[PDB]
């Protein structure tokens, strides 16, 4: 999971 | 402020390809000369300007069989159908002309672009 | 010896979400309490262990309406349906409990994992 | 396009  | 799962789109496409290989929820047969290819209309639309136009048509949206132009090569179509469901293109010296012609007909602009690039190099 | 188009899976998912927003080729309504959500069975199956099981069932595969357990929160479902079609999860303090519970019911293991991680941190 |  990432910060888009 | 959403978070994003990097592998989600790839995992979705992988599962859609698994459904295709097992003939699950396929709703159309694409006829290319004597050859038949089962697929999901939504995947075809998402990948191809031609299928997008066909299945948004109020009459054609309800057809279970679509016959392609007799000039379309079944192998070129097969390679492109595999690409739609995997992101992988089996581009070879012996098939590049048939793949580019089929991608132009199917309106798959990124495939047409790489075929034009690979032909130019040789 | 295939070549790969990096953005293909993301572009496919983006187009499937565009079809969803325009209600094109949607083939099922998911009922969550008083709320109704239109979707594509194949996308639901590709994202959820629960929908995968439902639509591979020889009887349920043909249903146009699926009613979820009355404990399922419509907002939690909406957030998860958006994630299915975009890879983006709107996880917030006020919704995390409903999102985790809905993801556990829908069998969306990667969402359950990030919810468990975010809860543990607080 | 890449070599996967
Ligand atoms: O080279 C290409 C690939 C492609 C895909 C689609 N399919 C869609 C486009 C839009 Cl805007 N919304 C929804 C869909 Cl399914 C149309 C044209 C082309 N051209
Ligand atoms: O967390 C999850 C997400 C998920 C998706 C699917 N859907 C498939 C799985 C296979 Cl192997 N082939 C085809 C499909 Cl559509 C099943 C279980 C789970 N669990
Ligand atoms: Cl393309
Ligand atoms: Cl997930």
XYZ file of N, CA and C and ligand atoms in Angstrom:
796
model
N 0.837 -1.204 0.000
C 0.000 0.000 0.000
C 0.875 1.259 0.000
N 0.485 2.271 -0.790
C 1.231 3.531 -0.948
C 0.296 4.733 -0.829
N 0.891 5.925 -0.727
C 0.186 7.196 -0.828
C 0.236 7.500 -2.343
N -0.902 7.454 -3.080
C -0.837 7.693 -4.539
C -0.521 9.139 -4.910
N -7.719 11.613 0.075
C -6.866 11.009 1.099
C -6.839 9.448 1.074
N -7.147 8.833 -0.074
C -7.121 7.369 -0.248
C -5.696 6.808 -0.122
N -5.572 5.512 0.193
C -4.319 4.749 0.111
C -4.486 3.895 -1.154
N -3.387 3.383 -1.716
C -3.463 2.582 -2.933
C -2.716 1.261 -2.837
N -3.325 0.175 -3.339
C -2.660 -1.124 -3.401
C -2.064 -1.283 -4.804
N -0.739 -1.091 -4.903
C 0.056 -1.133 -6.137
C -0.274 -2.314 -7.068
N -0.377 -3.530 -6.514
C -0.604 -4.731 -7.331
C -2.072 -5.020 -7.662
N -3.016 -4.193 -7.189
C -4.440 -4.484 -7.387
C -4.852 -4.667 -8.850
N -4.530 -3.699 -9.742
C -4.932 -3.795 -11.156
C -4.380 -5.062 -11.822
N -3.093 -5.382 -11.583
C -2.453 -6.578 -12.144
C -3.147 -7.842 -11.638
N -3.458 -7.896 -10.321
C -4.142 -9.041 -9.695
C -5.550 -9.200 -10.272
N -6.259 -8.076 -10.525
C -7.595 -8.145 -11.130
C -7.470 -8.778 -12.536
N -6.520 -8.280 -13.348
C -6.346 -8.777 -14.710
C -5.954 -10.253 -14.729
N -5.080 -10.663 -13.802
C -4.676 -12.060 -13.651
C -5.897 -12.942 -13.367
N -6.800 -12.498 -12.470
C -8.019 -13.258 -12.156
C -8.996 -13.286 -13.317
N -9.100 -12.179 -14.074
C -9.952 -12.166 -15.271
C -9.404 -13.145 -16.307
N -8.055 -13.250 -16.422
C -7.462 -14.215 -17.369
C -7.736 -15.663 -16.917
N -7.718 -15.910 -15.591
C -8.037 -17.227 -15.028
C -9.480 -17.574 -15.357
N -10.411 -16.593 -15.248
C -11.815 -16.833 -15.624
C -11.905 -17.184 -17.114
N -11.146 -16.453 -17.964
C -11.120 -16.733 -19.403
C -10.621 -18.163 -19.710
N -9.483 -18.567 -19.116
C -8.904 -19.900 -19.332
C -9.868 -21.012 -18.928
N -10.713 -20.759 -17.906
C -11.692 -21.736 -17.412
C -13.082 -21.550 -18.024
N -13.204 -20.616 -18.997
C -14.443 -20.280 -19.702
C -15.588 -19.861 -18.740
N -15.241 -19.133 -17.673
C -16.204 -18.689 -16.659
C -16.697 -17.283 -16.967
N -18.039 -17.133 -17.092
C -18.739 -15.864 -17.321
C -18.384 -15.202 -18.668
N -17.766 -15.961 -19.596
C -17.505 -15.465 -20.958
C -18.890 -15.262 -21.593
N -19.073 -14.162 -22.311
C -20.389 -13.800 -22.840
C -20.378 -13.478 -24.313
N -19.268 -13.781 -25.007
C -19.180 -13.524 -26.449
C -18.168 -14.482 -27.099
N -18.400 -14.809 -28.374
C -17.487 -15.588 -29.200
C -17.087 -14.653 -30.329
N -15.788 -14.501 -30.527
C -15.242 -13.705 -31.618
C -14.820 -14.713 -32.669
N -15.402 -14.592 -33.871
C -15.112 -15.484 -34.990
C -14.116 -14.803 -35.925
N -12.986 -15.482 -36.170
C -11.899 -15.006 -37.021
C -11.606 -16.154 -37.983
N -12.094 -16.015 -39.223
C -12.049 -17.049 -40.264
C -12.701 -18.338 -39.686
N -11.994 -19.472 -39.672
C -12.576 -20.712 -39.134
C -12.458 -20.799 -37.595
N -11.716 -19.861 -36.968
C -11.380 -19.892 -35.542
C -12.323 -19.104 -34.637
N -12.574 -19.637 -33.430
C -13.487 -19.049 -32.459
C -12.754 -18.738 -31.172
N -13.007 -17.556 -30.598
C -12.353 -17.133 -29.355
C -13.384 -16.647 -28.362
N -13.466 -17.302 -27.199
C -14.405 -16.893 -26.155
C -13.774 -15.815 -25.290
N -14.570 -14.818 -24.894
C -14.047 -13.706 -24.097
C -15.142 -13.011 -23.301
N -14.737 -12.013 -22.513
C -15.638 -11.177 -21.732
C -15.731 -9.860 -22.498
N -16.962 -9.457 -22.865
C -17.220 -8.195 -23.571
C -16.544 -7.012 -22.869
N -16.673 -6.896 -21.536
C -16.068 -5.760 -20.804
C -14.561 -5.670 -20.973
N -13.864 -6.811 -20.963
C -12.402 -6.822 -21.147
C -12.062 -6.390 -22.567
N -12.804 -6.930 -23.559
C -12.585 -6.540 -24.960
C -12.765 -5.024 -25.120
N -13.825 -4.455 -24.518
C -14.106 -3.005 -24.604
C -13.003 -2.179 -23.959
N -12.521 -2.627 -22.790
C -11.485 -1.922 -22.037
C -10.153 -1.846 -22.794
N -9.929 -2.789 -23.732
C -8.663 -2.911 -24.468
C -8.696 -2.427 -25.881
N -9.887 -2.347 -26.481
C -10.016 -2.103 -27.923
C -11.063 -1.066 -28.282
N -10.657 -0.064 -29.065
C -11.568 0.966 -29.556
C -12.673 0.369 -30.403
N -12.347 -0.700 -31.177
C -13.337 -1.381 -32.011
C -14.408 -2.089 -31.164
N -13.996 -2.917 -30.186
C -14.970 -3.597 -29.310
C -15.739 -2.618 -28.443
N -15.086 -1.515 -28.017
C -15.762 -0.454 -27.267
C -16.960 0.080 -28.083
N -16.729 0.389 -29.378
C -17.768 0.885 -30.280
C -18.861 -0.168 -30.494
N -18.468 -1.434 -30.751
C -19.411 -2.545 -30.990
C -20.340 -2.763 -29.805
N -19.780 -2.927 -28.607
C -20.620 -3.267 -27.467
C -21.325 -2.055 -26.816
N -21.086 -0.816 -27.287
C -21.873 0.334 -26.796
C -23.021 0.575 -27.771
N -23.037 -0.178 -28.881
C -24.134 -0.055 -29.837
C -25.344 -0.784 -29.268
N -26.497 -0.089 -29.191
C -27.754 -0.587 -28.629
C -28.239 -1.932 -29.217
N -27.840 -2.278 -30.462
C -28.182 -3.563 -31.074
C -27.070 -4.593 -30.918
N -25.816 -4.200 -31.223
C -24.686 -5.123 -31.158
C -24.325 -5.525 -29.734
N -24.644 -4.669 -28.724
C -24.354 -4.956 -27.299
C -24.954 -6.291 -26.851
N -26.034 -6.751 -27.541
C -26.774 -7.975 -27.221
C -26.389 -9.213 -28.052
N -25.402 -9.085 -28.942
C -24.978 -10.223 -29.755
C -24.022 -11.118 -28.970
N -24.179 -12.456 -29.128
C -23.307 -13.432 -28.463
C -22.181 -13.868 -29.415
N -22.289 -13.491 -30.702
C -21.298 -13.823 -31.725
C -20.947 -12.566 -32.529
N -19.638 -12.291 -32.671
C -19.105 -11.186 -33.471
C -18.132 -11.765 -34.499
N -18.385 -11.485 -35.784
C -17.538 -11.954 -36.875
C -16.630 -10.822 -37.326
N -15.322 -11.050 -37.259
C -14.358 -10.053 -37.710
C -14.195 -10.103 -39.219
N -13.650 -9.018 -39.774
C -13.354 -8.860 -41.204
C -12.516 -10.087 -41.682
N -12.865 -10.725 -42.831
C -12.115 -11.922 -43.283
C -10.616 -11.743 -43.513
N -10.115 -10.496 -43.622
C -8.684 -10.220 -43.772
C -7.933 -10.456 -42.445
N -8.653 -10.474 -41.305
C -8.007 -10.643 -40.000
C -7.489 -12.057 -39.821
N -6.217 -12.134 -39.456
C -5.477 -13.361 -39.231
C -5.782 -13.914 -37.814
N -6.240 -15.194 -37.696
C -6.555 -15.762 -36.363
C -5.398 -15.735 -35.361
N -4.152 -15.967 -35.827
C -2.986 -15.938 -34.932
C -2.737 -14.529 -34.376
N -2.807 -13.514 -35.242
C -2.673 -12.115 -34.834
C -3.717 -11.758 -33.794
N -4.970 -12.234 -34.006
C -6.030 -11.979 -33.026
C -5.719 -12.676 -31.701
N -5.316 -13.947 -31.759
C -4.988 -14.739 -30.567
C -3.910 -14.060 -29.700
N -2.838 -13.561 -30.353
C -1.727 -12.849 -29.701
C -2.271 -11.590 -29.016
N -3.168 -10.869 -29.698
C -3.759 -9.651 -29.133
C -4.730 -9.919 -28.013
N -5.516 -11.003 -28.115
C -6.448 -11.400 -27.041
C -5.641 -11.777 -25.783
N -4.531 -12.511 -25.961
C -3.636 -12.843 -24.856
C -3.096 -11.566 -24.208
N -2.654 -10.586 -25.029
C -2.156 -9.296 -24.519
C -3.247 -8.579 -23.691
N -4.490 -8.572 -24.188
C -5.585 -7.910 -23.466
C -5.691 -8.410 -22.038
N -5.624 -9.741 -21.863
C -5.774 -10.388 -20.564
C -4.493 -10.527 -19.738
N -3.317 -10.167 -20.297
C -2.066 -10.364 -19.536
C -1.099 -9.179 -19.494
N -1.243 -8.196 -20.412
C -0.288 -7.068 -20.620
C 0.961 -7.565 -21.386
N 1.018 -8.866 -21.746
C 2.180 -9.429 -22.438
C 1.926 -9.644 -23.913
N 2.805 -9.091 -24.753
C 2.674 -9.188 -26.204
C 3.750 -10.086 -26.823
N 3.324 -11.205 -27.448
C 4.238 -12.146 -28.102
C 4.559 -11.632 -29.517
N 5.400 -10.608 -29.578
C 5.779 -9.961 -30.836
C 7.025 -10.632 -31.372
N 6.931 -11.192 -32.599
C 8.041 -11.905 -33.257
C 8.166 -11.450 -34.712
N 9.354 -11.641 -35.304
C 9.610 -11.289 -36.708
C 8.535 -11.851 -37.641
N 8.177 -13.118 -37.442
C 7.191 -13.814 -38.267
C 5.736 -13.426 -38.076
N 5.403 -12.697 -36.994
C 4.013 -12.324 -36.741
C 3.752 -10.812 -36.668
N 4.817 -9.984 -36.600
C 4.706 -8.530 -36.383
C 3.778 -7.831 -37.384
N 3.840 -8.202 -38.674
C 2.971 -7.584 -39.669
C 1.504 -7.894 -39.389
N 1.174 -9.173 -39.077
C -0.209 -9.584 -38.775
C -0.682 -8.969 -37.457
N 0.210 -8.863 -36.460
C -0.138 -8.256 -35.162
C -0.445 -6.755 -35.350
N 0.419 -6.000 -36.079
C 0.175 -4.565 -36.293
C -1.142 -4.329 -37.027
N -1.382 -5.085 -38.117
C -2.622 -4.966 -38.913
C -3.858 -5.259 -38.049
N -3.791 -6.324 -37.227
C -4.897 -6.674 -36.333
C -5.096 -5.581 -35.258
N -3.995 -5.036 -34.687
C -4.089 -3.988 -33.651
C -4.665 -2.694 -34.230
N -4.342 -2.380 -35.506
C -4.891 -1.196 -36.178
C -6.414 -1.350 -36.350
N -6.850 -2.544 -36.764
C -8.265 -2.877 -36.950
C -9.000 -2.865 -35.606
N -8.370 -3.427 -34.563
C -8.992 -3.473 -33.239
C -8.895 -2.137 -32.512
N -8.091 -1.194 -33.040
C -7.873 0.137 -32.442
C -7.239 -0.005 -31.049
N -6.038 -0.607 -31.014
C -5.246 -0.824 -29.801
C -3.985 -0.026 -30.051
N -4.082 1.276 -29.777
C -3.060 2.270 -30.116
C -1.668 2.001 -29.555
N -1.538 1.526 -28.305
C -0.210 1.259 -27.736
C 0.498 0.083 -28.428
N -0.263 -0.960 -28.837
C 0.297 -2.094 -29.601
C 0.752 -1.594 -30.987
N -0.089 -0.790 -31.668
C 0.273 -0.237 -32.992
C 1.607 0.531 -32.897
N 1.757 1.357 -31.843
C 2.957 2.155 -31.570
C 4.228 1.307 -31.412
N 4.175 0.211 -30.623
C 5.367 -0.630 -30.441
C 5.709 -1.423 -31.711
N 4.690 -1.780 -32.528
C 4.878 -2.532 -33.776
C 5.585 -1.629 -34.769
N 5.128 -0.350 -34.870
C 5.741 0.663 -35.743
C 7.199 0.917 -35.346
N 7.486 0.909 -34.031
C 8.837 1.113 -33.503
C 9.744 -0.070 -33.833
N 9.265 -1.308 -33.594
C 10.018 -2.539 -33.854
C 10.292 -2.751 -35.344
N 9.325 -2.385 -36.221
C 9.495 -2.487 -37.681
C 10.568 -1.491 -38.154
N 10.498 -0.232 -37.648
C 11.434 0.851 -37.976
C 12.891 0.467 -37.651
N 13.117 -0.211 -36.499
C 14.442 -0.664 -36.047
C 15.096 -1.672 -37.015
N 14.288 -2.547 -37.641
C 14.742 -3.559 -38.596
C 14.676 -2.987 -40.003
N 9.382 -15.038 -24.531
C 10.027 -13.868 -25.128
C 9.068 -12.659 -25.369
N 7.957 -12.580 -24.625
C 6.989 -11.473 -24.721
C 7.604 -10.141 -24.264
N 7.029 -9.016 -24.709
C 7.312 -7.671 -24.188
C 6.090 -7.343 -23.319
N 6.207 -6.370 -22.410
C 5.097 -6.018 -21.531
C 4.799 -4.527 -21.500
N 3.509 -4.160 -21.540
C 3.099 -2.765 -21.405
C 2.724 -2.522 -19.939
N 3.635 -1.868 -19.201
C 3.538 -1.563 -17.768
C 2.165 -1.025 -17.323
N 1.607 -0.059 -18.066
C 0.340 0.577 -17.676
C -0.922 -0.167 -18.124
N -0.789 -1.300 -18.828
C -1.963 -1.992 -19.371
C -3.019 -2.364 -18.328
N -2.632 -3.064 -17.233
C -3.605 -3.488 -16.211
C -4.349 -2.294 -15.600
N -3.620 -1.211 -15.264
C -4.215 0.002 -14.690
C -5.200 0.632 -15.675
N -4.815 0.712 -16.971
C -5.665 1.278 -18.034
C -6.924 0.428 -18.219
N -6.797 -0.916 -18.132
C -7.967 -1.795 -18.242
C -8.934 -1.480 -17.077
N -8.403 -1.418 -15.842
C -9.235 -1.170 -14.667
C -9.907 0.200 -14.728
N -9.175 1.217 -15.197
C -9.711 2.564 -15.386
C -10.898 2.536 -16.357
N -10.777 1.795 -17.478
C -11.873 1.681 -18.451
C -13.050 0.894 -17.905
N -12.785 -0.152 -17.102
C -13.874 -0.900 -16.460
C -14.614 0.006 -15.479
N -13.879 0.901 -14.768
C -14.541 1.839 -13.842
C -15.398 2.860 -14.616
N -14.920 3.293 -15.801
C -15.674 4.205 -16.670
C -16.955 3.522 -17.118
N -16.889 2.214 -17.474
C -18.101 1.464 -17.845
C -19.070 1.415 -16.656
N -18.533 1.174 -15.437
C -19.361 1.151 -14.227
C -20.071 2.500 -13.979
N -19.323 3.618 -14.035
C -19.881 4.959 -13.814
C -20.990 5.287 -14.809
N -20.892 4.752 -16.045
C -21.886 4.982 -17.102
C -22.936 3.873 -17.186
N -22.890 2.911 -16.235
C -23.796 1.764 -16.142
C -23.814 0.904 -17.436
N -22.646 0.749 -18.071
C -22.510 -0.007 -19.320
C -22.098 -1.443 -19.036
N -22.913 -2.409 -19.525
C -22.679 -3.855 -19.430
C -22.673 -4.381 -17.980
N -23.183 -3.581 -17.021
C -23.346 -4.040 -15.631
C -24.394 -5.162 -15.690
N -24.165 -6.245 -14.959
C -25.022 -7.429 -15.051
C -25.502 -7.929 -13.711
N -25.310 -7.133 -12.645
C -25.767 -7.529 -11.309
C -26.021 -6.285 -10.442
N -26.964 -6.402 -9.503
C -27.253 -5.387 -8.499
C -26.948 -6.056 -7.169
N -26.124 -5.404 -6.365
C -25.795 -5.870 -5.024
C -26.640 -5.022 -4.095
N -27.494 -5.686 -3.302
C -28.383 -5.020 -2.354
C -27.767 -5.092 -0.959
N -27.585 -3.916 -0.339
C -26.999 -3.760 0.988
C -27.972 -2.868 1.757
N -28.773 -3.495 2.629
C -29.869 -2.858 3.371
C -30.808 -2.171 2.338
N -31.055 -0.863 2.456
C -31.938 -0.178 1.500
C -31.200 0.234 0.205
N -29.858 0.083 0.172
C -29.000 0.566 -0.913
C -28.688 -0.461 -1.999
N -28.614 0.005 -3.255
C -28.377 -0.838 -4.419
C -27.120 -0.397 -5.139
N -26.283 -1.358 -5.546
C -25.028 -1.058 -6.244
C -24.918 -1.893 -7.499
N -24.832 -1.237 -8.662
C -24.687 -1.947 -9.933
C -23.219 -2.230 -10.199
N -22.922 -3.416 -10.737
C -21.533 -3.804 -10.988
C -21.426 -4.873 -12.066
N -20.186 -5.249 -12.384
C -19.875 -6.309 -13.334
C -19.478 -7.511 -12.481
N -20.180 -8.644 -12.666
C -19.893 -9.896 -11.951
C -18.407 -10.260 -12.036
N -17.795 -10.194 -13.231
C -16.369 -10.562 -13.384
C -15.438 -9.730 -12.519
N -15.696 -8.423 -12.404
C -14.863 -7.544 -11.565
C -15.043 -7.915 -10.100
N -16.309 -8.134 -9.680
C -16.583 -8.545 -8.295
C -15.835 -9.847 -7.973
N -15.874 -10.832 -8.888
C -15.196 -12.131 -8.690
C -13.686 -11.969 -8.589
N -13.113 -11.122 -9.457
C -11.671 -10.889 -9.503
C -11.133 -10.258 -8.212
N -12.011 -9.563 -7.460
C -11.627 -8.817 -6.253
C -12.008 -9.457 -4.959
N -12.992 -10.360 -4.980
C -13.595 -10.881 -3.747
C -13.786 -12.386 -3.740
N -13.274 -13.041 -2.696
C -13.444 -14.480 -2.513
C -14.907 -14.854 -2.399
N -15.722 -13.970 -1.765
C -17.159 -14.206 -1.623
C -17.879 -14.177 -2.981
N -17.674 -13.115 -3.784
C -18.303 -13.041 -5.116
C -17.781 -14.113 -6.054
N -16.487 -14.480 -5.924
C -15.910 -15.579 -6.703
C -16.720 -16.872 -6.460
N -16.986 -17.194 -5.175
C -17.759 -18.375 -4.790
C -19.200 -18.281 -5.299
N -19.853 -17.114 -5.117
C -21.248 -16.886 -5.545
C -21.419 -17.085 -7.044
N -20.607 -16.402 -7.850
C -20.818 -16.459 -9.290
C -20.213 -17.709 -9.969
N -19.515 -18.593 -9.231
C -19.074 -19.874 -9.821
C -20.107 -20.940 -9.468
N -21.100 -20.569 -8.646
C -22.164 -21.509 -8.307
C -23.116 -21.598 -9.493
N -23.380 -22.829 -9.974
C -24.222 -23.125 -11.136
C -25.634 -22.497 -11.089
N -26.175 -22.205 -9.885
C -27.471 -21.539 -9.739
C -27.330 -20.036 -9.539
N -26.436 -19.616 -8.621
C -26.260 -18.199 -8.312
C -25.616 -17.417 -9.450
N -24.819 -18.092 -10.323
C -24.148 -17.442 -11.474
C -25.144 -16.711 -12.378
N -26.434 -17.147 -12.364
C -27.509 -16.609 -13.202
C -28.418 -15.570 -12.520
N -28.128 -15.215 -11.266
C -28.941 -14.223 -10.564
C -28.523 -12.809 -10.956
N -29.523 -11.908 -11.129
C -29.264 -10.505 -11.471
C -29.263 -9.643 -10.197
N -29.699 -10.225 -9.066
C -29.753 -9.539 -7.775
C -29.129 -10.427 -6.693
N -28.196 -9.855 -5.911
C -27.549 -10.513 -4.774
C -27.770 -9.649 -3.532
N -28.356 -10.247 -2.486
C -28.618 -9.556 -1.228
C -27.554 -9.942 -0.215
N -26.835 -8.948 0.297
C -25.819 -9.196 1.313
C -26.449 -9.323 2.689
N -25.693 -9.916 3.615
C -26.074 -10.106 5.020
C -26.524 -8.733 5.609
N -27.675 -8.662 6.330
C -28.150 -7.361 6.860
C -27.198 -6.612 7.790
N -26.161 -7.278 8.338
C -25.154 -6.631 9.183
C -24.206 -5.753 8.342
N -24.142 -5.983 7.015
C -23.229 -5.224 6.154
C -23.690 -3.790 5.992
N -22.762 -2.880 6.254
C -22.946 -1.443 6.188
C -22.821 -0.958 4.720
N -23.847 -0.239 4.179
C -23.776 0.237 2.776
C -22.560 1.107 2.452
N -22.130 1.973 3.395
C -20.957 2.828 3.168
C -19.669 2.000 3.050
N -19.490 1.027 3.948
C -18.351 0.109 3.903
C -18.307 -0.625 2.578
N -19.494 -1.073 2.093
C -19.551 -1.750 0.795
C -19.166 -0.790 -0.332
N -19.723 0.423 -0.318
C -19.449 1.443 -1.338
C -17.943 1.740 -1.468
N -17.261 1.906 -0.314
C -15.813 2.161 -0.236
C -15.061 0.981 -0.861
N -15.501 -0.246 -0.561
C -14.860 -1.445 -1.112
C -15.119 -1.642 -2.582
N -16.333 -1.315 -3.051
C -16.668 -1.397 -4.487
C -15.803 -0.387 -5.268
N -15.637 0.829 -4.726
C -14.760 1.831 -5.325
C -13.327 1.301 -5.410
N -12.825 0.678 -4.319
C -11.475 0.087 -4.302
C -11.336 -0.991 -5.402
N -12.351 -1.851 -5.549
C -12.299 -2.908 -6.569
C -12.010 -2.339 -7.944
N -12.708 -1.247 -8.299
C -12.597 -0.614 -9.610
C -11.486 0.430 -9.753
N -10.780 0.782 -8.657
C -9.755 1.839 -8.769
C -8.391 1.536 -8.146
N -8.302 0.532 -7.243
C -7.098 0.221 -6.419
C -6.970 1.237 -5.261
N -7.906 2.207 -5.151
C -7.840 3.234 -4.108
C -8.822 2.982 -2.986
N -8.315 2.953 -1.750
C -9.134 2.690 -0.571
C -9.296 3.934 0.309
N -10.548 4.418 0.455
C -10.855 5.589 1.282
C -10.994 5.144 2.750
N -9.858 4.868 3.375
C -9.804 4.384 4.756
C -9.680 5.574 5.684
N -10.657 5.729 6.604
C -10.701 6.844 7.567
C -11.020 6.317 8.967
N -10.661 7.092 10.000
C -10.936 6.733 11.398
C -12.398 6.335 11.607
N -13.315 7.121 11.044
C -14.753 6.900 11.177
C -15.347 5.738 10.402
N -14.603 5.163 9.438
C -15.135 4.063 8.636
C -14.333 2.757 8.718
N -13.114 2.791 9.300
C -12.186 1.648 9.318
C -12.808 0.362 9.876
N -13.599 0.457 10.958
C -14.232 -0.729 11.524
C -15.222 -1.348 10.543
N -16.075 -0.517 9.894
C -17.064 -1.003 8.915
C -16.370 -1.534 7.660
N -15.274 -0.888 7.230
C -14.515 -1.340 6.049
C -13.870 -2.713 6.333
N -13.196 -2.887 7.501
C -12.563 -4.175 7.826
C -13.594 -5.299 7.890
N -14.721 -5.060 8.590
C -15.804 -6.057 8.724
C -16.365 -6.444 7.346
N -16.597 -5.441 6.477
C -17.098 -5.698 5.124
C -16.048 -6.470 4.293
N -14.747 -6.106 4.407
C -13.677 -6.785 3.650
C -13.512 -8.235 4.111
N -13.708 -8.500 5.424
C -13.638 -9.866 5.959
C -14.777 -10.719 5.371
N -15.984 -10.146 5.317
C -17.173 -10.798 4.759
C -17.004 -11.024 3.253
N -16.466 -10.020 2.543
C -16.271 -10.136 1.098
C -15.045 -10.972 0.748
N -14.200 -11.290 1.747
C -12.961 -12.071 1.565
C -11.998 -11.324 0.627
N -11.593 -10.116 1.051
C -10.660 -9.245 0.330
C -9.485 -9.122 1.276
N -8.614 -10.132 1.222
C -7.511 -10.323 2.168
C -6.535 -9.157 2.283
N -6.163 -8.493 1.176
C -5.221 -7.367 1.255
C -5.822 -6.150 1.978
N -7.139 -5.893 1.794
C -7.841 -4.813 2.517
C -7.890 -5.159 4.019
N -8.243 -6.415 4.359
C -8.290 -6.849 5.772
C -6.926 -6.596 6.448
N -5.830 -6.952 5.749
C -4.449 -6.774 6.213
C -4.095 -5.310 6.519
N -4.437 -4.364 5.617
C -4.117 -2.951 5.867
C -4.982 -2.355 6.987
N -6.229 -2.856 7.158
C -7.156 -2.384 8.194
C -6.614 -2.814 9.544
N -6.160 -4.094 9.644
C -5.553 -4.646 10.865
C -4.288 -3.870 11.245
N -3.498 -3.454 10.238
C -2.271 -2.683 10.446
C -2.580 -1.274 10.947
N -3.537 -0.579 10.297
C -3.942 0.783 10.657
C -4.594 0.852 12.039
N -5.389 -0.180 12.413
C -6.025 -0.254 13.740
C -4.950 -0.438 14.826
N -3.981 -1.357 14.576
C -2.873 -1.667 15.488
C -2.035 -0.415 15.818
N -1.774 0.447 14.805
C -1.004 1.692 14.951
C -1.663 2.698 15.917
N -3.008 2.760 15.929
C -3.790 3.647 16.790
C -4.135 2.920 18.080
N 6.849 0.057 -22.738
C 7.062 -1.383 -22.915
C 8.394 -1.807 -22.286
N 8.405 -2.964 -21.604
C 9.581 -3.496 -20.897
C 9.787 -4.973 -21.224
N 10.948 -5.502 -20.825
C 11.239 -6.929 -20.843
C 10.753 -7.398 -19.452
N 9.660 -8.195 -19.351
C 9.169 -8.596 -18.015
C 10.089 -9.575 -17.290
O -6.285 2.136 -28.087
C -7.377 2.076 -27.547
C -7.820 1.209 -26.357
C -9.244 1.662 -26.131
C -10.160 1.287 -25.147
C -11.464 1.913 -25.190
N -12.437 1.597 -24.164
C -13.006 2.526 -23.318
C -12.742 3.918 -23.385
C -13.417 4.729 -22.499
Cl -13.078 6.414 -22.582
N -14.314 4.326 -21.549
C -14.555 2.992 -21.459
C -13.929 2.082 -22.298
Cl -14.237 0.450 -22.111
C -11.807 2.859 -26.200
C -10.859 3.230 -27.179
C -9.588 2.624 -27.123
N -8.474 2.869 -27.950
O -8.691 -11.854 -1.118
C -9.167 -12.388 -2.105
C -9.429 -11.787 -3.496
C -9.946 -12.974 -4.276
C -10.299 -13.079 -5.623
C -10.758 -14.372 -6.083
N -11.091 -14.550 -7.482
C -10.484 -15.464 -8.317
C -9.487 -16.379 -7.890
C -9.000 -17.262 -8.829
Cl -7.784 -18.359 -8.302
N -9.375 -17.340 -10.143
C -10.309 -16.450 -10.568
C -10.866 -15.514 -9.709
Cl -11.983 -14.421 -10.302
C -10.861 -15.487 -5.200
C -10.488 -15.358 -3.844
C -10.032 -14.099 -3.407
N -9.560 -13.744 -2.127
Cl -3.085 -1.126 -26.615
Cl -7.993 -7.118 -1.478
